[PDB]
């Protein structure tokens with residue numbers, strides 16, 4: 001939805017990257033094994049396949065992708 005700062009606290013439901021590719025579920029290990037996930041990062045709200053900023057990357061909320069050749073990509077939430 002709307003994001004503030006780096007979207008650290010973003011809890012919106014975008015599920016596709018800025019490029020229109022659908023995100024992979026954090027709880028999943030295919031096509032990509034996540035290094036960030038609910039088991040390991042309990043407080044980051046890594047729900048489903050939603051865009052999240054677990055590492056606070058300055059480019060914003062991102063997600064693992066369903067493209068075996070694109071491990072992760074940033075999504076476009078609008079600035080609150």
Ligand SMILES: NCCCCCC(=O)O
Pocket residue numbers: 034035036055057062072
């Ligand atoms: N800064 C976003 C990308 C982090 C890489 C993702 C990972 O391999 O856990």
